[PDB]
């Protein structure tokens, strides 16, 4: 529309696509940032290409070319606000410091209005949305009230709620949960308005989750419980959903998936994951406040119950359930260790859980079947296994599990050609 650079930018997307440095998007923007800074900040032009018609006589953009523009656009937003190169290409002067302020004002004021339009046009695209939700972090959230633009905040929260209810992708839900935490930044002005919008979204899914579990106690009844719970889990990670009673139906989903084994693997992974955040959130309130002794006991009982469920899930037939239950055990045993009392927090003696040798054996036994065994998926699985070994290596270094059996076993498996060599050499040294 207005901006002439529509031809320049439409071909920068092309120069980035047809040169196949697909993982150098943030690198490409930083490269041409010293010379082509003014072109890359024309976000008015970029939004016009995505939102406006290409006018008769011109050819429209392809689905992929529109995804590349968004990816390049968000990198320009990052480089402008942060005023430093991205991760991979690691002070400001006076003029540079002033330009950073104006750039934050320009990008905020532009995208306060246009971001809900972008989200609305491309709501059914998981890849694009996950990139579009990376923008609010760089906003100056005072302008929502300085400019009296609260009318557009509701449009954004309305579109965020629209993205959540029609998407189950793990990456999309991650972006939504992080955005709602940024809009609740507790800074000053908009803290109140976002909370009402947040509680509305949680309430509408706590009901659609609790009432969906009562129907599961069918192929369609399964998808109802999974979709409604996966969303709650991503939000429970970043937001204190303790006021809601989410542990209740999460435990019941596990206590009957263990007794009967009729539960599907993915529902168990989310139910286990959701309950982990609930316990961690309950611990933050107990830690920050001046609690009573009853509070420690009810949390002591809740933590003990979940740890038992995680041990039983180690014997599940499905590998993802086995994998998920292992990582939660390593994290909880580290959080609820003797280090938990360190820092003058002696009033947490009951909450300390030390693993018995029966459980320490099961953890070491899990490393034997899923870490030490005999192109996009083998590099995918290599990081999957390295994370599991590092989680157990943490327990060894901090004297949470007995080290004498694990140390000798690691020395016998060092025949894995640096696959775990750097991890193993570090854990062996710290003894």
């Amino acid at each position: 529309s207005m901006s002439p650079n529509g031809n320049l930018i439409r071909m920068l997307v092309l120069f980035f696509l047809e040169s196949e440095l697909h993982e150098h998007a943030a690198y490409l923007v930083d490269s041409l940032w010293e010379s082509s800074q003014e072109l890359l900040k024309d976000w008015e032009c970029m939004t016009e290409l995505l939102l406006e018609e290409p006018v008769q006589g011109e050819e429209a953009m392809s689905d992929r070319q529109e995804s590349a523009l968004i990816e390049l656009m968000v990198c320009t937003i990052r480089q402008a606000a942060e005023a430093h190169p991205p991760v991979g290409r690691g002070v400001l002067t006076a003029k540079e410091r002033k330009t950073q302020i104006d750039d934050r004002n320009k990008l905020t004021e532009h995208f306060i209005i246009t971001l809900p339009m972008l989200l609305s046009k491309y709501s059914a695209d998981a890849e694009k949305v996950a990139n579009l939700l990376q923008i609010p972090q760089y906003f100056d959230l005072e302008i929502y009230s300085t400019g009296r633009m609260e009318k557009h905040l509701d449009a954004l929260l309305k579109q965020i709620k629209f993205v959540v209810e029609k998407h189950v992708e793990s990456d999309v839900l991650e972006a939504c949960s992080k955005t709602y935490s940024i809009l609740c930044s507790e800074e000053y002005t908009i803290q109140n308005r976002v909370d009402i919008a947040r509680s509305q979204l949680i309430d509408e899914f706590v009901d659609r989750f609790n009432h969906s579990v009562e129907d599961l106690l069918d192929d369609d009844d399964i998808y109802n419980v999974l979709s409604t719970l996966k969303r709650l889990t991503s939000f429970h990670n970043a937001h204190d959903l303790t006021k809601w009673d989410l542990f209740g139906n999460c435990y019941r989903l596990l206590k009957t998936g263990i007794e009967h084994g009729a539960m599907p693997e993915q529902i168990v992974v989310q139910a286990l994951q959701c309950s982990h955040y609930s316990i961690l959130w309950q611990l933050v309130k107990i830690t920050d406040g001046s609690p009573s002794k009853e509070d420690l006991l009810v949390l002591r009982k809740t933590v003990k119950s979940f740890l038992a469920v995680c041990q039983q899930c180690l014997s599940n037939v499905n590998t993802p359930v086995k994998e998920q239950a292992f990582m939660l055990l390593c994290d909880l045993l580290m959080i609820f260790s003797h280090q938990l009392m360190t820092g003058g927090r002696e009033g947490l003696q009951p909450l300390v859980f030390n693993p018995d040798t029966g459980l320490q054996s099961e953890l070491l036994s899990f490393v034997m079947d899923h870490v030490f065994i005999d192109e996009a998926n083998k590099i995918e699985a290599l990081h999957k296994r390295r994370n599991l070994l590092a989680a157990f290596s943490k327990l060894i270094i901090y004297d949470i599990v007995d080290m004498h059996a694990a140390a000798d076993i690691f020395k016998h498996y060092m025949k894995y050609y640096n696959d775990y060599g750097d991890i193993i050499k570090e854990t062996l040294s710290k003894t």
Partner: peptide, 27 residues
């Protein structure tokens, strides 16, 4: 590399208040 593995939990915690629980047990 391994420094990032031994400094962060196995399950990533998005909220900084939750992540403090795992980091306070380090150093």
């Amino acid at each position: 590399g391994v420094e990032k593995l031994f400094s962060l939990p196995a399950q990533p915690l998005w909220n900084n208040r939750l992540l403090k629980l795992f980091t306070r047990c380090l150093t």
